[PDB]
Amino acid sequence: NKSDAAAKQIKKLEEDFDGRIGVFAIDTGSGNTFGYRSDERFPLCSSFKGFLAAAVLERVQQKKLDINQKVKYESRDLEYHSPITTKYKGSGMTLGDMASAALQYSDNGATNIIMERFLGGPEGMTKFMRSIGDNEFRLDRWALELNTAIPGDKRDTSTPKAVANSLNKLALGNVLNAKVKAIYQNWLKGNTTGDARIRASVPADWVVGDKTGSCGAYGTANDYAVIWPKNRAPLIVSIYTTRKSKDDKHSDKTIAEASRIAIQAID
Ligand SMILES: *C(=O)[C@H]([C@@H](C)O)[C@H]1C[C@@H](SCC/N=C/N)C(C(=O)O)=N1
Of the candidates 200, 199, 175, which has an alpha carbon nearest to the alpha carbon of residue 189? Predict the structure, then answer.
């Protein structure tokens, strides 16, 4: 009942914003879930940057990479939206600081430097997700270029369910050991780009780690989060949206509200 009604409200909400809404939410304590269009495909936009940071952490843990190892890139033509990498181009950055920048500011230069040098490009990123049991995720193109969000293009997409399940595994599961897991979780908590999304949907005394995506086209934006309520078990929330026309703008309020609705469903 609480699930069917929840679904009606998501459906009216996508009708109000003239697009498509995908939701998957998990209560990790009760194992309750709620899903709407959770197995439909949606562009990742920047959101894969959250999974990229975890990939780096897995390498670190197998001692293939040092978190403090220096990354130099002073001759690189930096991608658009490299707010962090741009400032430090002259000195370079630690891998840790680069990886966290890719997540916490969605830095394109950080994302792409990491993917060229450490992770084996998009396909290596895809391989990483496969290796944790995620069979929907696919990364086809590099950061920035992948944000075309052309309707019916399956490149650089996943599903809300798969995103939630992957996030669950990485943020709360046993893919990462206790140490590098805790670094991952802190990274997520310190995200700077999602105050108007899942974060706006929860009491302020709840702790959230999230990663957003905003393609800048077809009104395509997303957010995914781990939520540590007070006096309650962690939640996972995964919110993916598209709109009909190229010049449709994304809707933060729609994500926020879908998040409220989703959380009600699993309460
Ligand atoms: C990924 O989705 C984006 C693309 C340019 O690679 C980046 C850009 C930011 S948009 C910041 C929100 N709006 C600001 N005015 C972004 C993100 O929001 O996650 N990732």
Answer: 199
